[PDB]
Each structure stands twice: as structure tokens, then as C-alpha cells.
Design a protein around this ligand. Structure first.
Ligand code: A1A24
Ligand code: MG
Length: 215
């Protein structure tokens, strides 16, 4: 029930600061990166389930789901992948992301396009192109549901989740969109971006659209 506060490694903190402030033109690539991450998580539970099919019982369906929350200025990206335990969420520290982070910053200084972020293994942080904070809600078969929260500063929190929908298994990124990036709440725009950048994905990409029933 306590909010545990933790500190990012310096390299991650520095990368988030670069990304949240960059004026890069092609911000829509964040969605490709997050879909790719969702797919990779799905691959991992599929791999487990091939050995042990009972691993799917927590959430039998394998999906990626995009849920615009217009009234909240939030975009949710949900998967039924393997998920993250509390210890996984706390351990972006002491992880391959440290290496990816530093190398990627050096590449940026050399002129690399921001769209190369996923080649360094740190495409998760591309969400700060369009969002000023994020909650990562996650449920792994081995642990309870937790929420990790970051505003691109030096600290993050991890809290036992007593306030969100039950995921069953997997991860949901809740992106609090920047005021100039609200185009990513619109059905038409999300479809365009998915079609352009995420043609080859093994799992259904479900878009949740809210429409008024009219006469
Ligand atoms: N939608 C998603 N679902 C998932 S679900 C998952 C499981 N991730 C586990 C990582 C640890 N893994 C252990 C490992 O398997 C790795 N390993 C295998 N061989 C060599 N090493 C292993 C096993 C045994 C052992 F002894 C040592 C080990 F390290 C198991 C999978 C990660 C993940 N991510 C994601 C992808 C991108 C990321 C982050 C998170 N980051 C992030 C982390 C926390 C909070 C916010 C963001 C930051 C960087 O980028 C998703 O967005
Ligand atoms: Mg287990």
C-alpha cells in the first residue's frame, strides 16, 4: 500500500530529459516502439506457454489493445504479455537499458535519427516524445499487480495496484499526453500510424473506440 520511491540511474534520467524536450518532427514513431515492446512481451508468454499451457490461464487471449481516454487526455497501450513483477519494475536499474541508453545518446550526438531508438533497445523511452508522464501497470503470473510511475525526472514510484482494472496478465502503459499531442487520441490518426509502422505484428492490434449512439 506504501508508495516506494526509487532513483533512476543517471544515464536513464539523462535520456528521458533529452527525449521529453526534443523537437524531433516524427513523434508518431513512439507507437511503433510501444507496439514492438508489447509484441516482444507476448512472445515471451507464448514461449512459456508452449512448455506449460497453464501459464495462459491468467488471461487466455493474446492481444495488443490501444484505448484512447479522451476526457483524461490519456492514451493506454495494453498487452497480455508476460508482464513484470514488482522486482522487474524496480529493476530498470541494473538492466541492459543502462547500456542501450548511453550508446544511444552518443549516437544522437553523432547525428542519429531519434527513430533509431529501438535499435539500442530503449524504444520504451520514446513515449516521452508525446507524453509528459506515464504509469506502467503490470501483472506477472508470479506477483500481484503493480503500478510504476515516472515524469521523466530522476525519481519513479512503485505502488501495489489497488486502483486500476485487473489486467489478468500483462502490461498497460498509460500515457498522459502533452497538450499539443492530442491527435493520438483520434481513431483515424491511430489507424494511420499503426498501418504505416506496425504492418508486421503477430498479435491482433485492437483499437477501442467510444462513439455516441445517435438517432
Ligand atoms: N509492454 C511491456 N511488457 C514488458 S514484459 C517485460 C519483461 N522483461 C523482463 C526483464 C528481465 N528478464 C530477465 C532475463 O530473462 C533477461 N535475460 C535473459 N537472458 C539474458 N538476460 C533473465 C533471466 C534469468 C536470469 F538469471 C537473468 C536475467 F536477466 C525477464 C523479462 C518488459 C516489458 N516491457 C518493457 C520493454 C522494454 C523496456 C522496459 C519494459 N522498461 C521498463 C521497466 C520497468 C518499468 C518501466 C519500463 C525499460 C526499458 O525497456 C514492456 O514495455
Ligand atoms: Mg511462475
Amino acid at each position: 500500500a506504501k508508495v516506494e520511491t526509487h532513483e533512476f540511474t543517471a544515464e536513464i534520467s539523462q535520456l528521458m530529459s533529452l527525449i521529453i524536450n526534443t523537437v524531433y518532427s516524427n513523434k508518431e514513431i513512439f507507437l511503433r516502439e510501444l507496439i514492438s515492446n508489447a509484441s516482444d512481451a507476448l512472445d515471451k508468454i507464448r514461449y512459456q506457454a508452449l512448455s506449460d499451457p497453464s501459464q495462459l490461464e491468467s488471461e487466455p487471449e493474446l492481444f495488443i489493445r490501444i484505448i484512447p481516454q479522451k476526457d483524461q487526455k490519456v492514451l493506454e497501450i495494453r498487452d497480455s504479455g508476460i508482464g513484470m513483477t514488482k522486482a522487474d519494475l524496480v529493476n530498470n536499474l541494473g538492466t541492459i537499458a543502462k547500456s542501450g541508453t548511453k550508446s544511444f545518446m552518443e549516437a544522437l550526438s553523432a547525428g542519429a535519427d531519434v527513430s533509431m531508438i529501438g535499435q539500442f533497445g530503449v524504444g520504451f523511452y520514446s513515449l516521452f516524445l508525446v507524453a509528459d508522464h506515464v504509469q506502467v501497470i503490470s501483472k506477472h503470473n508470479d506477483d500481484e499487480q503493480y503500478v510504476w510511475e515516472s515524469n521523466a525526472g530522476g525519481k519513479f514510484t512503485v505502488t501495489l495496484d489497488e486502483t486500476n482494472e485487473r489486467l489478468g496478465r500483462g502490461t498497460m502503459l498509460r500515457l498522459f499526453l502533452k497538450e499539443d499531442q492530442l491527435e493520438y487520441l483520434e481513431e483515424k490518426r491511430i489507424k494511420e500510424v499503426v498501418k504505416k509502422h506496425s504492418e508486421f505484428v503477430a498479435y491482433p492490434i485492437q483499437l477501442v473506440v467510444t462513439k455516441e449512439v445517435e438517432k
